[PDB]
Amino acid sequence: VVATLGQPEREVAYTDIKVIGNGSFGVVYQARLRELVAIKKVLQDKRFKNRELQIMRKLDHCNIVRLRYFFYSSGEELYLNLVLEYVPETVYRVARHFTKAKLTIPILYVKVYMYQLFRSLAYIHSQGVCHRDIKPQNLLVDPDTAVLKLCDFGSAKQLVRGEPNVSYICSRYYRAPELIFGATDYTSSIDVWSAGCVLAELLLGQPIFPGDSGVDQLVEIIKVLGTPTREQIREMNPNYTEFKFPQIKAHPWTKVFKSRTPPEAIALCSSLLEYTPSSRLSPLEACAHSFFDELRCLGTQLPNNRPLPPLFNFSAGELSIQPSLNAILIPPHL
């Protein structure tokens, strides 16, 4: 198969293919090279560009899955096939293994993985890309090196001020409250909300907001955060300000997590899981949170007697997003 090089244009032959994902929004396979490769097939309108392909071409980060190649197939009808870097595990599978084993994920792994998620969101938002599907199933992780990579940019979109966008987006457990309220003017801070849900899930061993419907998803959030004020509703969807919603007391933040949950981990959760989207931490601000202070200490290593993954190789563009946080992000050493 002749395929164009991912990162300039450009001969590919693969082996050991297997279907690991079906349904609408495409079909996903795995392949071999002697490397490992992922294939995703989607139906594409020949008259328009593929949104994900243009997104994947624009991005280059150590915490983003690499687009190796891409090629077309007819089927008879055009199908775009995206040749993607293969990563052995997902955060969902690792978390499920720990819960199935009735064990808690060590906080250092939670620290290492969450930092790379927030770093990836800082990068994509700098390039004007909103993931819109941030969930553990879309977080690739290497079991040994503990590097995290963001993938599945099918729902990704460049949110332009003034352009309405679909409200019913993201997976339900990680959907921001303004989306459930039907907001069409939402921003990339919805990715931050989903990242907050992922962090809480890793500390709790189960999703923090397990909604069985759109309405009950908002009920599950209110049971934790309390009923949002009318002013918080105004920033989410001003069409809901004049309803009289029952006032539910907020469950204390320290009372929703386990006894041994670190105090700063709870603090980070409260700073990201905010009703008002503008009050949520920026992805770089989350990286600068004290919850990640261990990763910046001189001498911290992975539990499996291995060094920490790349966490401070920030590019000049990365250094330019929020200059004030760069004192924390790069420690005195390095």
């Binding site: 908002l218 009920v219 069409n239 809901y240 919603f245 029952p246």
Partner: peptide
């Protein structure tokens, strides 16, 4: 989809847990 309808379901569900 209608805010009036959605709010009432939210209210009725919220009172069931209050």
């Amino acid at each position: 989809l209608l805010p009036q309808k959605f709010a009432e379901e939210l209210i009725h569900r919220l009172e069931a847990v209050q």
